[PDB]
Amino acid sequence: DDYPSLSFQQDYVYIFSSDFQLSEELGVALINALSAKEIVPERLYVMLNDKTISFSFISKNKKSKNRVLSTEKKLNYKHISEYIVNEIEY
Amino acid sequence: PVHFYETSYKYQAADSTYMHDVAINVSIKGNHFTSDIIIRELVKSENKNYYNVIGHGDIIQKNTHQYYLNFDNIDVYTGTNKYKEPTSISSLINKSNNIRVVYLSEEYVVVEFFFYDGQIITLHRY
């Protein structure tokens, strides 16, 4: 196996990444953002790699929303959080 | 006993307007599987090209949450008139492609699989 191990678990957030620093920053930002917009996911999985970023948003209705994002240079917690939160809320 | 899995996702290039809309459908009758994938490419929000990819082979369970697929057939249909590929056809028909489960349920499953050299996704069961 080579997939990044889990690195952050809150109420509904799961984050697989080899960068524990970016995971922490990203999780709290998601919790904050989704609560501010009063959005309650049944579960939210996220995966961080060198090039790609992917997540799965499992709704309270158990219908999921999956996304992938490849990027030249790495992004930080705010850019990823705004991207994820933007896709979820649509 | 056959277990069906289905899901969709959208790939987005951060350095371009290029993107995929991908619908995934898997059928597992025990030790073998049949995957059906439809990739609609959009550039500038315009249906550019499409791909229908059909797979077949063996799904081998290594550990309780660690699988891998061995394809014996891959079939690609595309538009006759002539980009990022989620996976290369040669890397599928030569290697074993790992799938690590991270959560199991009766309505859906969550896995980390080999598209884009690392992707996490949720599949609905039926």
Residue numbers in the entry:
A (entry chain A): 164 to 253
B (entry chain B): 31 to 112, 118 to 161
Q: What does the primary publication say about this deposited structure?
A:
In V. parahaemolyticus, the activation of T3SS2 by bile salts is regulated by two transmembrane ToxR-like transcription factors, VtrA (VPA1332) and VtrB (VPA1348). Furthermore, we demonstrate that the periplasmic domains of the transmembrane proteins, VtrA and VtrC, form a functional complex that binds bile salts to activate VtrA’s cytoplasmic DNA binding domain, which in turn induces T3SS2 via the downstream transcription factor VtrB. The structure of VtrA/VtrC periplasmic domains reveals an obligate heterodimer where VtrC recruits structural elements from VtrA to complete a β-barrel with a hydrophobic inner chamber that binds bile salts. Our biochemical data and the structural analysis demonstrated that the periplasmic domains of the inner membrane proteins VtrA and VtrC form a stable complex that functions as a receptor for bile salts.
To further understand the nature of the interaction between the periplasmic domains of VtrA and VtrC, we crystallized the complex and obtained its X-ray structure. The structure was solved by multiple-wavelength anomalous dispersion phasing using anomalous signals from selenomethionine and refined to a resolution of 2.70 Å using native data from an isomorphous crystal. The VtrA and VtrC subunits in the heterodimer make extensive interactions with each other, with an interface area of 1,149 Å2. The VtrC subunit consists of eight β-strands and a short α-helix. The eight β-strands of VtrC form a β-sheet meander that folds into itself to form a β-barrel with a small space between the first and last β-strands (Aβ and Iβ). The β-barrel is lined on the inside by hydrophobic side chains and is covered on one side by the short α-helix (Fα) and an adjacent disordered loop, which could not be modeled in its entirety due to the poor electron density of this region. The Hβ-Iβ loop is particularly rich in aromatic side-chains, promoting us to hypothesize that this loop could be involved in binding the steroid ring structure of bile acids. VtrA Fβ intercalates between VtrC Aβ and Iβ, making numerous polar contacts with VtrC Aβ and closing the gap in the VtrC β-barrel. The incorporation of structural elements from VtrA into the β-barrel fold suggests that VtrC may not fold properly in isolation and is consistent with our inability to purify the VtrC periplasmic domain in the absence of VtrA.
